[PDB]
Design a protein around this nucleic acid. Structure first.
Lengths: 101, 256, 48, 95
RNA sequence: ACCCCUAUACCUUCUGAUGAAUUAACUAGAAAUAACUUUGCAAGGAGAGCCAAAGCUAAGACCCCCGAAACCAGACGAAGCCUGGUGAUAGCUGGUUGUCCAAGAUAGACAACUUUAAAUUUGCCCACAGAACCAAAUCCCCUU
RNA sequence: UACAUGCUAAGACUUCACCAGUCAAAGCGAACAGUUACCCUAGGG
């Protein structure tokens, strides 16, 4: 047992650097504020709540395998994949009165 | 008290009435290892030979000065700290004396002549701001033992030994005017005191003007453990005398 | 087929690192980075 | 371990623990990682950084080590320039 | 009294054959490091040494019985036998003696479960939503 | 295939423990040995 799978489910609060999922193959894709690793493990780049969505898959032009698979699609198909997002909770900062000069 | 009033009416306390406090006596109830696979590292490699120094903070010294336990009108040695029980040092367990500590640098208002084995820059500054003197002196294990508890030494019958010079490692420390070494050049002290006063933003008071200057300038020369006594003397505590040899070779040995 | 060899820095001396090289290919010289002088310098092998 | 020695009737320390571990006065035991100097040529830089690290011990490991060392090794030591002085006391712990 | 009804001796070991005629006597848990409880005193404690970032001192309370072949040394007889090492050791059985109350049984590769005491705050049950391309359900989970 | 497969550092994962293992933001710096029918003893079938 490799003990792979989703580590943090939907609606779960997440801190920066938390690992969301560990996968051998891209079962889930990095979405907003979710970074990937060498092991293709999805970690969180911000602090917030995890959401799982279905999004249109437009792969990178340099990815020749994904590119020609996209080409072989008819003019009826559009590829979809499951993405993982972190909706950030806290604002990135506040303005405080330091001194009255 | 009401309890003694209660005792008035109760039967006499005898050996047939006593009882332990409840909760005092539990009833007798009757009817590759982990630490091997880990690599060796030299965490405790030379621990028995490392020097240790008990910290005397300025809060503690102020507190002891403040309750009459350490007299700041006389020089403050290790003997005075041990007698005032402000510091407890064990020569076994390789203590090498007392290190002054800057804790309580603010709110230290005492004019003292202290002698400590180590002193931080801030602690020296705090003492010298109030018109005080700090010296850093050295004590070998044997002389340190004699200083901390002189009375059990005087019951041993041996003539007072001369304390040894620092080892090679500690000679640069104690020959330096920045840490007020007791083997440092007196001439460089005013420079160092002015540097500290300038750095920490206080005026350096010249000690020569206060009536305690004679006391604040009292130091014991190296190879002396106690202030008024010289090495080679024997203390006769029973009849309250000091015996000093007059032999030439002995005097040469003790004045070396 | 391959040998674990060591290269020694020409600059920032006393710094070395290990790589792998083929048994038949020529003497191995690289341009590595050393933190002794904190710069990139050449490394030339000395011992296999 | 020896709870009662044949000459003094005293407990005895296991010197392997002393040669492998540092005990912080707070109760924490510090150890090195296995293989931090063995076969470094193939290890990835992340792994080498992980192995070149002073690491804390388990609660069970800590109590077991406390059982295999005597009180002398649990005493407060005031060394002169100890790099681990700041770690001997514990700060802001709320259990 | 019996007749009626009810009632598969006990102990040990198995997941649920062993021993014991009977009576009397004898016959089997030994360690205070830490921690806890109760005192003393308290930035100090302790009747030197030791400890101390509330500690230290003192007390209390935890660690069984029987049962090899061997090996060694020195004798005594003609390898054996004896004494000592020796309460040898290793395995594996068996036995471990008053009462009451409370808590208290099934994953595994030390861990799991279990006891006591202490500090604090969520625990369990769970609804929508939510978890992959190549059936049962499970994970997550606010309400209640 | 590569020579920054450098240095440091939040936060997490993990084969039910442990030991080991992974991922990583920001920052600095850079690109861009057999045998015993002589066998012996404690047990088990």
């Amino acid at each position: 047992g490799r003990r792979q799978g989703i580590k943090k489910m939907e609606g779960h609060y997440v801190h920066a650097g938390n690992i969301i999922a560990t996968q051998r193959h891209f079962r889930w894709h990095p979405g907003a504020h979710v970074g990937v690793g060498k092991n293709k493990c999805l970690y969180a780049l911000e602090e917030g709540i995890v959401r799982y969505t279905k999004e249109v898959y437009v792969p990178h032009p340099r990815n020749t395998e994904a590119v020609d698979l996209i080409t072989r699609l008819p003019k009826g198909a559009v590829l979809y994949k499951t993405f993982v997002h972190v909706v950030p909770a806290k604002p990135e900062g506040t303005f405080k009165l330091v001194a009255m000069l | 008290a009401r309890a003694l009033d209660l005792l008035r009416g109760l039967p006499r306390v005898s050996l047939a009435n006593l009882k332990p406090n409840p909760g005092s006596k539990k009833p007798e109830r009757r009817p590759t290892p982990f630490y091997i696979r880990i690599p060796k590292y030299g965490f405790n490699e030379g621990h028995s030979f490392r020097r240790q120094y008990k910290p005397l903070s300025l809060n503690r010294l102020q507190y002891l000065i403040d309750l009459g336990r350490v007299d700041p009108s006389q020089p403050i040695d290790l003997t005075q700290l041990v007698n005032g029980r402000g510091v407890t040092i064990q020569p076994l367990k390789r203590d090498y004396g007392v290190q002054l500590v800057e804790e309580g640098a603010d709110t230290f208002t005492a004019k003292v002549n202290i002698e400590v084995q180590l002193a931080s820059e801030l602690a020296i500054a705090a003492i010298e701001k109030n018109g005080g003197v700090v010296t850093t002196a050295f004590y070998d294990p044997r002389s340190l033992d004699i200083v901390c508890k002189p009375v059990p030494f005087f019951l041993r019958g041996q003539p007072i030994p001369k304390r040894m010079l620092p080892p090679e490692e500690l000679v640069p420390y104690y020959t330096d005017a920045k840490n007020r070494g007791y083997l440092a050049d007196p001439a460089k002290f005013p420079e160092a005191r002015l540097e500290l006063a300038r750095k920490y933003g206080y005026i350096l008071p010249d000690i020569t003007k206060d009536e305690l200057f004679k006391m604040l300038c009292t130091r014991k020369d190296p190879r002396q453990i106690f202030f008024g006594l010289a090495p080679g003397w024997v203390v006769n505590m029973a009849d309250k005398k000091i015996l000093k040899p007059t032999d030439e070779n002995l005097l040469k040995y003790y004045t070396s | 087929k391959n040998i674990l060899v060591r290269m020694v820095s020409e600059a920032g001396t006393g710094f070395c690192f290990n790589t792998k090289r083929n048994r038949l290919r020529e003497k191995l010289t690289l341009l590595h980075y050393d933190p002794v002088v904190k710069q990139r310098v050449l490394f030339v092998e000395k011992k296999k | 371990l020896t709870y009662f020695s044949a000459r003094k009737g005293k407990r005895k320390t296991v010197k392997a623990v002393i040669d492998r571990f540092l005990r912080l006065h707070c109760g924490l035991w510090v150890r090195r990682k296995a293989g931090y100097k063995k076969k470094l040529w193939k290890k990835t830089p992340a792994r080498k950084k992980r192995l070149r690290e002073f690491v804390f011990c388990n609660k069970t490991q800590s109590k077991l080590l406390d059982k295999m060392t005597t009180s002398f090794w649990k005493r407060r030591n005031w060394y002169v320039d100890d790099p681990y002085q700041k770690y001997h006391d514990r700060t802001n712990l709320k259990v």
